[PDB]
């Protein structure tokens, strides 16, 4: 099934259980600007190939659109599309000044050279500068694009914009050197933890000492289990890669299975813990579950199996709307999946303040600052939850949108 088509679904299914009206929904059920671009690069053997280019602007009511830039070979203008208009919801449920935007290149990455690399990301930012700046649209790091062709893109916007104004604000994800900000590697995770630091405080569940698995051990994952287990005081009992799982009751030690990952490329028999796999793993009497890996881990089949009282959506929806209804009905507690995870966007609207201001601050000021915006998001969605007496993935839909359908009406765009 197509993206699009989903993200619409899933638009109308919000706006069910709120008051919206028609035009407003016919407005956001529209990106509001949508750029497909011919990206030339000259190759390494002379010869000039040209690449598909993407840049939605799905709304920007709120303020600057943002979001990222993704190198797949399997990208699409559907997926661009969907993916800008979860922008503006992510964005929305944790009240930054933002629009919801999304870019993207299809392109095999992995068949680029680094002068490739570089010369597709210089022609990328020349095709979209028209419709991209500090204050129009920031574009970010995502799937296949890192730090590096982030600073290559912002010295081919200054470039351009000949340093008439804030360049390094332009783009986030960008190297330390050049207008990074700190806290950049643990945004999410930091993020998944204050999220469930306030479910624990919502449900009464203190945390010192209780346990935690988590699904998928790359950065998000790792850093989450790292991160819960100094922060939280929890016991981390098992985790997992795409290979296989480990398990130990009385606790794993991160850093180790991380550096028994990094010799022996993969988590699986680490001394002390026994192999387990994903789906077994995700049923283990654990205080919290955090999926960081895979979308879609977490359905019909194995719903009324999970035995975690809280499960954080660290990953893009790794849970399905059966699911989702089967655990509400266990009294589980969801955190939604672009409300755990909404770190990451967070930090980097941190990173665009901080080029805006031409003033930078240290890892405290930004860790104070996300917990500041987590906590108040998470109680905002909570506390929609229980008001309005819907699920949890409803009422963040729900306080999204209704943002969104303010902004919009502030503007005079609808009248209604
Ligand atoms: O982006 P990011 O930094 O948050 O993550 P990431 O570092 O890009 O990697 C994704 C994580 O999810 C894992 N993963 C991918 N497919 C999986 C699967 N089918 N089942 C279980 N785990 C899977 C990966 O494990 P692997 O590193 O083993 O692929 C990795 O731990
Ligand atoms: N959420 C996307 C892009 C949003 C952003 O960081 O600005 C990401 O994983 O990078």
Redesign the pocket.
């Known amino acids: 099934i197509d993206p699009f088509e989903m993200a619409v679904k899933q638009l109308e299914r919000a706006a069910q259980y709120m008051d919206i009206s028609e035009e407003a929904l016919e407005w956001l059920k529209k990106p509001m600007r949508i750029v497909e671009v011919s990206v030339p690069i000259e190759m390494d053997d002379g010869s000039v190939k040209v690449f598909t280019g993407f840049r939605v602007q799905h709304n920007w009511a709120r303020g600057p659109t943002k979001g990222g830039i993704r190198w797949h070979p399997a990208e699409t203008l559907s997926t661009v599309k969907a993916l800008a208009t979860w922008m503006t919801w992510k964005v929305a449920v944790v009240d930054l000044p933002y629009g919801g935007g999304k870019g993207g290149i299809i392109v095999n990455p992995k068949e680029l050279s680094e002068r490739e690399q570089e010369r597709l990301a210089r022609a990328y930012i020349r095709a979209v500068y028209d419709v991209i700046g500090p204050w129009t649209d920031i574009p970010a790091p995502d799937v296949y694009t890192n730090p590096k062709i982030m600073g290559w893109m912002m010295d081919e916007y200054e470039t351009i914009m000949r340093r008439k104004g804030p360049a390094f604000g332009v783009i986030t994800g960008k190297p330390l050197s050049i207008g990074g900000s700190l806290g950049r590697g643990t945004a ?1 995770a930091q993020g998944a933890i204050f999220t469930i630091r306030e479910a624990a405080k919502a449900l009464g569940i203190d945390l010192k000492g209780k346990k935690i698995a988590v ?7 790792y850093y989450t289990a790292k991160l819960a287990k100094e922060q939280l005081g929890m016991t981390v009992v098992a985790v ?4 296989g799982g480990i398990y130990n009751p009385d606790g794993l030690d991160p850093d180790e299975v991380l550096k028994w990952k990094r010799e022996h490329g ?1 988590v699986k028999d680490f001394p002390g813990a026994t192999n387990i796999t ?1 789906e077994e793993l995700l049923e283990l009497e654990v205080d919290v579950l955090a999926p ?3 979308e879609e881990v977490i359905t019909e089949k194995n719903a009324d199996n999970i035995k975690a009282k809280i499960v954080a959506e660290v990953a893009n929806g790794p849970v399905t709307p059966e699911a989702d209804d089967i655990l509400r009905e266990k009294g589980i507690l969801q955190i939604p999946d672009f409300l755990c995870n909404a770190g990451g966007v967070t930090v980097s609207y941190f990173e665009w303040v901080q080029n805006i201001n031409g003033y930078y601050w240290t890892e405290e000021e930004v860790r104070e600052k996300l917990d500041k915006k987590m906590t108040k998001a998470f109680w905002e969605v909570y506390n929609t939850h229980k008001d309005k007496n819907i699920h949890m993935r409803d009422a963040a839909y729900v306080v999204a949108v209704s943002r969104v359908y303010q902004a919009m009406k502030d503007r005079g765009w609808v009248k209604k």
């Open positions: 999410t699904q998928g051990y790359g950065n998000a994952g997992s890669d795409s290979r993969s994903n960081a890996a895979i």
